Structure 1
Amino acid sequence: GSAPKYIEHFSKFSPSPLSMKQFLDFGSSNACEKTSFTFLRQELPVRLANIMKEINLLPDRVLSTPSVQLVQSWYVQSLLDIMEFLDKDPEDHRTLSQFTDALVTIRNRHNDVVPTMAQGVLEYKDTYGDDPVSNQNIQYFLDRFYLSRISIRMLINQHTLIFDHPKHIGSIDPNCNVSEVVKDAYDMAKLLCDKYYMASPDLEIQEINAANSKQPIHMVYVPSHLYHMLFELFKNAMRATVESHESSLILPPIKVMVALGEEDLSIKMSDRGGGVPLRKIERLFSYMYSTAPGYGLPISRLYAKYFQGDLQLFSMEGFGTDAVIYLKALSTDSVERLPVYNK
């Protein structure tokens, strides 16, 4: 075959990071399925090949494991699917129709990658141990691998959702009400918490719009990404709150604050679930230390970092924990954070 040839060629190109404003302007009224196809048939192989070349640089002790090999075969096949559209003509409506169906097949093919890499991490711990040098190598690779996967899925979701005057531009809401997303993630976590604990804390939301005290806080963002982060944070904050008060009757509420600054949009989730010692907080974001025979926090941070944001934890052992999602307030600052294969 010629899969190594394709990887070597496109890995020389660097991925082109797109801003949130670019996604919005590309997918709005000026959206053209021809233009998106011309861009994607080149950018998708570049992003695929860059992470595929990093996978090849893994030691053969990891490269020859069944988990890495299975995932690498998914990327080879996905890369080859995109290759067949290079010589195709964008002026043919059947060419664009087959390209969209090919993206859906690729998206569903990689749908079960989180438990697969979780199996791979557990295999590495039981084969070579959990030394701190191995954790940093696993953390470094998995962060870049998953962030690369988020960026590829973002491109595919924007194309397939738009080419199928709505208010949503694919997966992007140009008027995303942050408090409403907080409530949705809270309600879902409350339903799970009531079914398993027969008790759940209440929600308190406070907004701080520094520039316009009266106006509700809106932003341009991907609501599903923000939901994912808040949902994982709500589940942890409820689990800790209920378990740390089993012998008590009062159940402290979960307090969420949404602050809109001139540059940052910050979401703080405060719980009183007993807190966690600092020594163990720094391990909650580690794939290796969060794997048992549990990736909500590490992946949630990658979603935050994907558009130049962050997700941070600071706890008070014996009381509770604060979780803060940092997002860019302006669409011009919300640029893709992409891993690039360098030397």
Structure 2
Amino acid sequence: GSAPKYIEHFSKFSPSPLSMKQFLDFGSACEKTSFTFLRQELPVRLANIMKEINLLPDRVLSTPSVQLVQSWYVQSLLDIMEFLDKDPEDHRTLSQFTDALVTIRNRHNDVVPTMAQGVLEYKDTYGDDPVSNQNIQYFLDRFYLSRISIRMLINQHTLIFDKHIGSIDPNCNVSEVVKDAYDMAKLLCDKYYMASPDLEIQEINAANSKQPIHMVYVPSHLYHMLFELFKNAMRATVESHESSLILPPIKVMVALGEEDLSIKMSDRGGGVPLRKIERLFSYMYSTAPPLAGYGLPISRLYAKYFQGDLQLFSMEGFGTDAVIYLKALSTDSVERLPVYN
């Protein structure tokens, strides 16, 4: 077959990062334009990461987990090729493309735990030295960020072409998503422990005091990050106080500035020493044989994906602040994509 040839062809192109603006307009031009865009852009994005996978050393590349994921990417690229010559005006072309995208999305559902098995095997077969850790971190941050970007494209297409524009809410109420993610975390926390901390939210709308804070965002991404952070803040608060009786609440501040929309989650879970902070973001050090890959490093990629970030600052003996940084403005919300070279 031609998969290596295709990988070589399409890996010559740079992925084309889109803004919220471009994402919103695609959900007004129409389906024909999304098809002609995606049938070029997905092969570019697939090929770019596949080429990087092929640069891994043979002792990583030859393992079953990487071979299995490499085979998903090959099939998914070939499924998209079928459509390069097809005629956009034929509505049978268009509905078949949507079908093809749903299959591809489903096919890659188990990438995270599959890659996690590759990390476990590497730890036991070659060891867990700091240079191994940086290469795993380098590779998986790029791989998972690439994968987030591909799921975004597919989701926008399949959801729009069967108020919200697919996975985008142009009027996302940040505090509502905070409450949702808290309510779910509380549910799990009450089940596994005899207690759960309460929630306090404070908003700070710098330019428009007391006006509720809204933004253009992908609320499922924001929920994913807030849920992960609530789980950690709840486990820590509960376990650090099981001999205590009082249970400090989790305090969330939502700040809207000129360019940043910032969400701080503060707990009194007794904190972590600075030395152990880097480990919490490490795919390697957080892989082993939360509440009852991994949550923190992947939550940080979701934040990075539209030019944001997620930082942890702890105070050993007191507690931990987690901050999600997002761009306030849809104009500054552009895909961050790993480019091959």
TM-score (norm. length: structure 1): 0.98
Any runs of at least 4 consecutive aligned residues in structure 1 with deviations exceeding 3 A, and if so which?
A: none
Shift of 1:26: 1.8
> Equivalents in 2 of 1:290, 1:31: separation in Å?
44
Shift of 1:157: 0.2
**Does residue 259 of structure 2 align to residue 263 of structure 1?**
yes
SS of the counterpart of 1:216?
coil
Alignment correspondent of 1:68: 66
Residue deviations 1:226-266 (CA, integer Å, cap 9, x gap): 00000000000000000000001000000000000000000
Shift of 1:22: 1.1
Identity %, equivalent residues: 100
Shift of 1:283: 1.1
Shift of 1:31: 3.4
> Equivalents in 2 of 1:13, 1:86: separation in Å?
16
> Equivalents in 1 of 2:137, 2:19: separation in Å?
26
Shift of 1:198: 1.6
Shift of 1:101: 0.2
> Equivalents in 1 of 2:83, 2:331: separation in Å?
31
SS of the counterpart of 1:54?
helix
Q: Can you give the 5+ residue segments of structure 2 that lack an aligned partner in the other structure?
A: none
In the alignment, which of 37, 43, 49 is matched to residue 47 of structure 2? 49
> Equivalents in 2 of 1:96, 1:313: separation in Å?
44
Residue deviations 1:30-59 (CA, integer Å, cap 9, x gap): 431000000000000000000000000000
Shift of 1:163: 0.3
Residue deviations 1:123-177 (CA, integer Å, cap 9, x gap): 000010001000000000000000000000000000000001xx00000000000
SS of the counterpart of 1:80?
helix
> Equivalents in 2 of 1:79, 1:173: separation in Å?
30
SS of the counterpart of 1:283?
helix
CA RMSD for the aligned pairs?
A: 0.6
> Equivalents in 2 of 1:20, 1:212: separation in Å?
23
Alignment correspondent of 1:25: 25
> Equivalents in 2 of 1:182, 1:69: separation in Å?
39
SS of the counterpart of 1:273?
coil
Residue deviations 1:86-122 (CA, integer Å, cap 9, x gap): 0000010000010000000000000011111111100
Shift of 1:20: 1.0
> Equivalents in 2 of 1:214, 1:136: separation in Å?
44
Shift of 1:214: 2.0
> Equivalents in 2 of 1:114, 1:213: separation in Å?
42
SS of the counterpart of 2:268?
strand
SS of the counterpart of 2:312?
strand
Alignment correspondent of 1:277: 273
Aligned length: 337
> Equivalents in 2 of 1:312, 1:284: separation in Å?
11
Shift of 1:330: 0.3
> Equivalents in 2 of 1:129, 1:214: separation in Å?
54
Q: Can you give the 5+ residue segments of structure 1 that lack an aligned partner in the other structure?
A: none
> Equivalents in 2 of 1:301, 1:37: separation in Å?
30
> Equivalents in 1 of 2:220, 2:63: separation in Å?
33
SS of the counterpart of 2:188?
helix
TM-score (norm. length: structure 2): 0.98
